[PDB]
Design a protein around this ligand. Structure first.
Ligand code: 69B
Ligand code: CA
Length: 115
């Protein structure tokens, strides 16, 4: 199948919106990580490919995905970065886990529909 960018945006954006909507848990994930501002200067050493909700939104808005699994992969890159960088006690780690719970419910029917 050839997926048009407007079709991917229309189908997938609600699943991203579900993550944005989560408070407090989306807060760490709404903007790209700025290691200087956050006082975590080793972040890019450990996290080779940073990813966040706003970057994913921008990719949908600008037609950067050819396939819907590329979108799923970026969401999971964001999750895996957070579980990699943070210890299990951190808010960021626990908030990530909550987003993954929400996402799994949202994404399932949408991916089935897209095929
Ligand atoms: C995802 C990003 C990078 C990472 O993996 N660890 C990390 C460490 C310190 C603060 C943060 C961090 C970044 C932005 C935040 C926050 C934490 C938070 C606090 C509510 C949890 N609010 N916002 C706007 C952080 N999160
Ligand atoms: Ca809530």
């Amino acid at each position: 199948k050839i997926f048009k960018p407007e079709e991917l945006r229309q189908a997938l954006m609600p699943t991203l919106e579900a993550l944005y909507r989560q408070d407090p848990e989306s807060l760490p994930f709404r903007q790209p990580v700025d290691p200087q501002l956050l006082g975590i200067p080793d972040y890019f050493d450990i996290v080779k490919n940073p990813m966040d909700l706003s970057t994913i939104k921008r990719k949908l808005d600008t037609g950067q995905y050819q396939e819907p699994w590329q979108y799923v992969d970026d969401v999971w890159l964001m999750f895996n970065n957070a579980w990699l960088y943070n210890r299990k006690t951190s808010r960021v780690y626990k908030f990530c886990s909550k987003l993954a719970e929400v996402f799994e419910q949202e994404i399932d029917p949408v991916m089935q529909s897209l095929g």
